[PDB]
Design a protein around this motif. Structure first.
Motif, mmCIF file in Angstrom:
data_model
loop_
_atom_site.group_PDB
_atom_site.id
_atom_site.type_symbol
_atom_site.label_atom_id
_atom_site.label_comp_id
_atom_site.label_asym_id
_atom_site.label_seq_id
_atom_site.Cartn_x
_atom_site.Cartn_y
_atom_site.Cartn_z
ATOM 1 N N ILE A 89 -48.343 -23.022 -14.330
ATOM 2 C CA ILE A 89 -47.180 -22.709 -13.497
ATOM 3 C C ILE A 89 -46.673 -21.325 -13.905
ATOM 4 C CG2 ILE A 89 -44.837 -23.322 -12.797
ATOM 5 C CD1 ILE A 89 -45.605 -26.293 -13.621
ATOM 6 N N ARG A 90 -46.842 -20.343 -13.020
ATOM 7 C CA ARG A 90 -46.551 -18.947 -13.366
ATOM 8 C C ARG A 90 -45.167 -18.833 -14.002
ATOM 9 N NH1 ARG A 90 -47.520 -15.793 -8.466
ATOM 10 N NH2 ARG A 90 -45.344 -16.343 -8.008
ATOM 11 N N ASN A 91 -45.120 -18.259 -15.207
ATOM 12 C CA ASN A 91 -43.881 -18.234 -16.002
ATOM 13 C C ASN A 91 -43.181 -16.870 -15.997
ATOM 14 O OD1 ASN A 91 -45.539 -16.840 -17.776
ATOM 15 N ND2 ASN A 91 -45.469 -18.344 -19.454
ATOM 16 N N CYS A 92 -43.658 -15.968 -15.151
ATOM 17 C CA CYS A 92 -43.010 -14.687 -14.942
ATOM 18 C C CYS A 92 -42.643 -14.556 -13.464
ATOM 19 C CB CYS A 92 -43.912 -13.534 -15.411
ATOM 20 S SG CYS A 92 -45.601 -13.564 -14.734
ATOM 21 N N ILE A 93 -41.774 -13.599 -13.143
ATOM 22 C CA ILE A 93 -41.312 -13.455 -11.768
ATOM 23 C C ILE A 93 -41.991 -12.287 -11.054
ATOM 24 C CG2 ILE A 93 -39.094 -14.726 -12.081
ATOM 25 C CD1 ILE A 93 -37.734 -11.873 -12.010
ATOM 26 N N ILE A 94 -42.254 -12.497 -9.772
ATOM 27 C CA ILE A 94 -42.706 -11.437 -8.858
ATOM 28 C C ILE A 94 -41.484 -11.033 -8.037
ATOM 29 C CG2 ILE A 94 -44.240 -10.838 -6.884
ATOM 30 C CD1 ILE A 94 -45.847 -11.603 -9.455
ATOM 31 N N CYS A 141 -33.661 -22.558 -13.356
ATOM 32 C CA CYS A 141 -33.272 -21.237 -12.842
ATOM 33 C C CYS A 141 -34.036 -20.960 -11.548
ATOM 34 C CB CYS A 141 -33.593 -20.167 -13.895
ATOM 35 S SG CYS A 141 -32.638 -20.312 -15.435
ATOM 36 N N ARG A 142 -33.304 -20.629 -10.484
ATOM 37 C CA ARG A 142 -33.905 -20.379 -9.181
ATOM 38 C C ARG A 142 -33.177 -19.242 -8.461
ATOM 39 N NH1 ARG A 142 -37.510 -22.669 -11.139
ATOM 40 N NH2 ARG A 142 -38.497 -24.654 -10.589
ATOM 41 N N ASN A 143 -33.845 -18.662 -7.474
ATOM 42 C CA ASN A 143 -33.239 -17.614 -6.646
ATOM 43 C C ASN A 143 -33.457 -17.978 -5.173
ATOM 44 O OD1 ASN A 143 -31.942 -15.251 -5.918
ATOM 45 N ND2 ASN A 143 -33.637 -13.884 -6.499
ATOM 46 N N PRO A 144 -32.817 -19.078 -4.715
ATOM 47 C CA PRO A 144 -33.090 -19.680 -3.401
ATOM 48 C C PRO A 144 -32.858 -18.742 -2.209
ATOM 49 C CG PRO A 144 -31.045 -20.527 -4.301
ATOM 50 C CD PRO A 144 -31.717 -19.774 -5.409
ATOM 51 N N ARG A 145 -31.940 -17.789 -2.348
ATOM 52 C CA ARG A 145 -31.657 -16.820 -1.275
ATOM 53 C C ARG A 145 -32.264 -15.427 -1.518
ATOM 54 N NH1 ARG A 145 -26.731 -15.403 -0.312
ATOM 55 N NH2 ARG A 145 -25.571 -16.191 -2.130
ATOM 56 N N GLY A 146 -33.012 -15.277 -2.610
ATOM 57 C CA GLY A 146 -33.729 -14.034 -2.906
ATOM 58 C C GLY A 146 -32.845 -12.838 -3.197
ATOM 59 N N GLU A 147 -31.750 -13.090 -3.905
ATOM 60 C CA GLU A 147 -30.768 -12.062 -4.218
ATOM 61 C C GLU A 147 -31.234 -11.147 -5.352
ATOM 62 O OE1 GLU A 147 -26.710 -13.805 -3.940
ATOM 63 O OE2 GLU A 147 -27.812 -15.700 -4.194
ATOM 64 N N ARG A 161 -19.020 -19.948 -13.758
ATOM 65 C CA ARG A 161 -19.562 -20.596 -12.562
ATOM 66 C C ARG A 161 -21.092 -20.450 -12.449
ATOM 67 N NH1 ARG A 161 -18.449 -23.107 -7.717
ATOM 68 N NH2 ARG A 161 -19.750 -22.395 -5.970
ATOM 69 N N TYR A 162 -21.588 -19.222 -12.566
ATOM 70 C CA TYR A 162 -23.031 -19.004 -12.544
ATOM 71 C C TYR A 162 -23.398 -17.816 -13.415
ATOM 72 C CZ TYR A 162 -22.328 -15.049 -9.388
ATOM 73 O OH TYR A 162 -21.945 -13.846 -8.839
ATOM 74 N N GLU A 163 -24.661 -17.766 -13.821
ATOM 75 C CA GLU A 163 -25.198 -16.612 -14.540
ATOM 76 C C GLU A 163 -26.692 -16.489 -14.243
ATOM 77 O OE1 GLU A 163 -24.992 -16.694 -18.892
ATOM 78 O OE2 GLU A 163 -25.019 -14.509 -18.997
ATOM 79 N N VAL A 164 -27.192 -15.252 -14.208
ATOM 80 C CA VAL A 164 -28.638 -15.004 -14.122
ATOM 81 C C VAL A 164 -29.369 -15.507 -15.356
ATOM 82 C CG1 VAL A 164 -28.428 -12.964 -12.640
ATOM 83 C CG2 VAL A 164 -28.460 -12.661 -15.160
ATOM 84 N N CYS A 165 -30.638 -15.858 -15.170
ATOM 85 C CA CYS A 165 -31.494 -16.208 -16.294
ATOM 86 C C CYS A 165 -32.348 -15.012 -16.674
ATOM 87 C CB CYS A 165 -32.348 -17.421 -15.954
ATOM 88 S SG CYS A 165 -31.332 -18.761 -15.292
ATOM 89 N N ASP A 166 -32.906 -15.059 -17.880
ATOM 90 C CA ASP A 166 -33.608 -13.932 -18.497
ATOM 91 C C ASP A 166 -35.134 -14.079 -18.386
ATOM 92 O OD1 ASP A 166 -34.065 -11.654 -20.005
ATOM 93 O OD2 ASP A 166 -33.128 -12.438 -21.837
ATOM 94 N N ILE A 167 -35.662 -14.101 -17.168
ATOM 95 C CA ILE A 167 -37.096 -14.379 -16.972
ATOM 96 C C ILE A 167 -37.844 -13.070 -16.652
ATOM 97 C CG2 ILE A 167 -38.820 -15.762 -15.692
ATOM 98 C CD1 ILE A 167 -36.175 -17.606 -15.087
ATOM 99 N N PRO A 168 -38.908 -12.761 -17.416
ATOM 100 C CA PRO A 168 -39.510 -11.435 -17.299
ATOM 101 C C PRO A 168 -40.315 -11.237 -16.023
ATOM 102 C CG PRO A 168 -40.773 -12.743 -18.834
ATOM 103 C CD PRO A 168 -39.571 -13.574 -18.455
ATOM 104 N N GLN A 169 -40.354 -9.991 -15.532
ATOM 105 C CA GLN A 169 -41.256 -9.611 -14.445
ATOM 106 C C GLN A 169 -42.690 -9.781 -14.912
ATOM 107 O OE1 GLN A 169 -40.970 -8.029 -11.173
ATOM 108 N NE2 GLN A 169 -38.958 -9.010 -11.302
ATOM 109 N N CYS A 170 -43.565 -10.259 -14.029
ATOM 110 C CA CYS A 170 -44.998 -10.326 -14.370
ATOM 111 C C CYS A 170 -45.578 -8.947 -14.690
ATOM 112 C CB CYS A 170 -45.803 -10.979 -13.248
ATOM 113 S SG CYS A 170 -45.372 -12.693 -12.914
ATOM 114 N N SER A 171 -45.226 -7.950 -13.875
ATOM 115 C CA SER A 171 -45.736 -6.582 -14.039
ATOM 116 C C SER A 171 -44.705 -5.544 -13.601
ATOM 117 C CB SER A 171 -47.032 -6.384 -13.235
ATOM 118 O OG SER A 171 -47.524 -5.052 -13.346
ATOM 119 N N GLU A 172 -44.266 -4.736 -14.557
ATOM 120 C CA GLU A 172 -43.369 -3.613 -14.300
ATOM 121 C C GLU A 172 -43.658 -2.532 -15.331
ATOM 122 O OE1 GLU A 172 -39.059 -4.422 -14.299
ATOM 123 O OE2 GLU A 172 -38.984 -3.319 -12.407
ATOM 124 N N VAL A 173 -44.334 -1.476 -14.890
ATOM 125 C CA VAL A 173 -44.774 -0.405 -15.781
ATOM 126 C C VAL A 173 -43.933 0.853 -15.566
ATOM 127 C CG1 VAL A 173 -46.715 1.071 -16.482
ATOM 128 C CG2 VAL A 173 -47.114 -1.340 -15.891
#
Ligand SMILES: O=C(O)CCc1ccco1
Lengths: 173, 173
Positions: A89-94, A141-147, A161-173
């Motif tokens: 299950i991909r553990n980084c974000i696109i 942790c989810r981004n249902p509206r793609g914000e 009330r809410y906070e972002v989670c700290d999930i790394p980008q798969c690829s950012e150079v």
């Protein structure tokens, strides 16, 4: 006992469509027996990426695919629980992680996320049923509206009330 | 709990961005560090890794790992580094030269041969002569950036080597 290491989806199995894909099944006593064999990959002629336990037929079904794999579909059944190996299950974000399906459930400041199905501490309208496809399950942790902020959650701290989670980008150079 | 971490013996991490948070505590065993990190209790950040100082019996919990920018991997005989698998990229970029995950099973389900071992297969893929490539344990690796992605020597005497089944980061949505 490795079952707690899988992502569990209740009342769900997977079906092949494409009959080319391979499965392995065995009658057992408990779901943890399926987990052990999947984790060890003992006696399977493929990489175990997921398994289903059938509580009525007392069967393990081991798969070389998961619910995200091409040519497989979810099927509903009260007797089935699906367990997906987190290694597949991909553990980084696109991008902004609209499609993130991983199990991170803590915010950037270390606060445990509130469940999507709960209105405690925070009342909200991000009901799982209103956001099908967006996997608003457990307290992930989810981004249902793609914000722009990336995956986030309502927080178990009444003061936040809410906070972002700290999930790394798969690829950012 | 400690098995949800990738262990690197004789290693610690040092931060060069002074703003990055750290928390330490005198404990008894590394297992107790893993517990607190997994449960993320009393940590004002997301625990992505921890070090156990075996000499001082101290946990050092971090909101970063060895792949984070602003931190350095350093040798130290009294340290063991434990990296939370949820934060080690589990999909492949390009040919997977940079893959550092813990998958140790080939595509046909065979347990990988340890890189240090010469049984059943003899090879010149020595860890020391491939510094930086993380040829530890029996992990699927792609030290030379070859076509099929990460691979290993196989524990089956009749299969010298086979690729593993690690997905591309672009495979899924
Ligand atoms: O506070 C709310 O109900 C809105 C949820 C949200 C948080 C960030 C973006 O959208």
């Amino acid at each position: 006992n490795t079952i707690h290491e899988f992502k569990k989806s209740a009342k769900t199995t997977l079906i092949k469509i494409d009959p080319a894909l391979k499965i392995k099944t065995k009658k057992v006593n408990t779901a943890d027996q399926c987990a052990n064999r999947c984790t060890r990959n003992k006696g399977l002629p493929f990489t175990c990426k997921a398994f289903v336990f059938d509580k009525a037929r007392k069967q393990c079904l081991w798969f070389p695919f998961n619910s995200m794999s091409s040519g497989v579909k979810k099927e509903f059944g009260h007797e089935f629980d699906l367990y997906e190996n987190k290694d597949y299950i991909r553990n980084c974000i696109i991008g902004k992680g609209r499609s993130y399906k991983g199990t991170v459930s803590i915010t950037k400041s270390g606060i445990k996320c509130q469940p999507w199905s709960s209105m405690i501490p925070h009342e909200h309208s991000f009901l799982p049923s209103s956001y099908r496809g967006k996997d608003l399950q457990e307290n992930y942790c989810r981004n249902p509206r793609g914000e722009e902020g990336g995956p986030w959650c309502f927080t178990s701290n009444p003061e936040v009330r809410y906070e972002v989670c700290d999930i790394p980008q798969c690829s950012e150079v």
